[PDB]
């Protein structure tokens, strides 16, 4: 499924995302919309290590959930890659959780650090009443 910004917005509210770890709202927003443009079904094969990452958030197979294909991985969401495939986020929200527990936080994706750290991401929920 591919959801509409605001949509997106209301959905991650709900599931207790604004804040979460110190993390806003609009930065998870703005994380979803550059890994996957919103898109659920969304997956990048990464040739270079032989990982898959999955779902709107682009969870990586090595760390976080289990595809059995990935060399030298580790399943520290406790999730199977299929589940972050589903047009029911609940369980990528989950994983999503998991991963910002780490130090790191929201730093882990190098895609947040490119092209939403120290910027107006205000853009991201703007009018979705969230």
């Given at each position: 499924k591919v959801f509409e910004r605001c949509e997106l917005a209301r959905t991650l509210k709900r599931l207790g995302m604004d804040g979460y770890r110190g993390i806003s709202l609009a930065n998870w927003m703005c994380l979803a919309k550059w890994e996957s443009?919103?898109?659920?079904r969304a997956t990048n094969y990464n040739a270079g290590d032989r990982s898959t990452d999955y779902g709107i958030f682009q969870?990586?197979?090595?760390?976080?959930?289990?595809?059995?294909?990935?060399?030298g991985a580790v399943n520290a969401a406790h999730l199977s890659c299929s589940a972050l495939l589903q047009d029911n986020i609940a369980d990528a929200v989950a994983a999503a959780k998991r991963v910002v527990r780490d130090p790191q936080g929201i730093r882990a994706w190098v895609a947040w650090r490119n092209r939403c750290q120290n910027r107006d991401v205000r853009q991201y929920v703007q009018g979705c009443g969230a």
């Open positions: 443009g919103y898109n659920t969870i990586n197979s090595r760390y976080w959930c289990n595809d059995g294909k990935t060399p």
